[model samples]
Target chain A: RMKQIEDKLEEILXKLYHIENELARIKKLLXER
Target chain B: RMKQIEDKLEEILXKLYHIENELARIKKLLXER
Candidate 1:
């Protein structure tokens, strides 16, 4: 039997959260507001 | 500004540094202690 496991969305989400926040902050600054 | 606080590469290096440092620390702990 092969042990296969799908990665957790929560882990992916946590990683993405930082990138999203960084993008949001940059976006705000880029928009010059 | 955070001119008085001690800053680390981990802060600017993000998740990538975390992976490297954690791995190195584990190796050090295994070898030295």
Candidate 2:
């Protein structure tokens, strides 16, 4: 159970990181526009 | 330029919402485990 949750946590964390990166780019585009 | 940014912003916003939802689920699992 702990391992499963840890795995899920890492998976979601990676996705969150990706989303954060895109958010940075989006915010930059907003600034440019 | 404005329209492009607006569209990208909306797209990213949706993704952010999605990630947030997943995070909530992950949080719940974390608590359970």
Candidate 3:
């Protein structure tokens, strides 16, 4: 049996992780900038 | 924010604790059974 995820779950998670990684990467980039 | 999770949410949090204990208890019980 499989239960589907909430429609917003993936979008929310994706956006959140994207922002997190972007922050981390941008922080590193700006540090060296 | 996480992949490591138990889906059952009856007690969601308590279920998580219950599941961890149940798995360990089942492992022991099965070993002794």
For each candidate, the alpha-carbon lDDT, in order, equals: 0.45, 0.61, 0.45
Candidate 2 chain B lowest-lDDT run of ten: B24-33
Worst 10 residues of 3 chain B by lDDT: B1-10
Give TM-scores of the second chain, every candidate.
Answer: 0.41, 0.70, 0.39
Q: Model 3 off-target regions past 4 Å? A: A1-5, B1-33
DockQ, Cα level, model 1: 0.03
Q: In model 2, what lDDT does residue B3 have?
A: 49
In terms of docking quality, model 3 is incorrect
- Over B1-33, each residue of candidate 3 has an lDDT whose tens digit, in order, gives 123223332224443464465457445544653
Supply fnat for every model shown.
Answer: 0.00, 0.00, 0.00
Q: Which consecutive 10 residues in model 1 chain A have the weakest lDDT in total?
A: A1-10
In the range A1-33, model 1's lDDT, one tens digit per residue, is: 111112233444565676565557555544753
TM-score of each: 0.33, 0.44, 0.34
Candidate 3 residue lDDT tens string, A1-33: 123443344454556556555555544544442
User: TM-score of predicted model 3?
Assistant: 0.34
iRMSD (1 decimal) for each model: 19.6, 19.0, 16.4
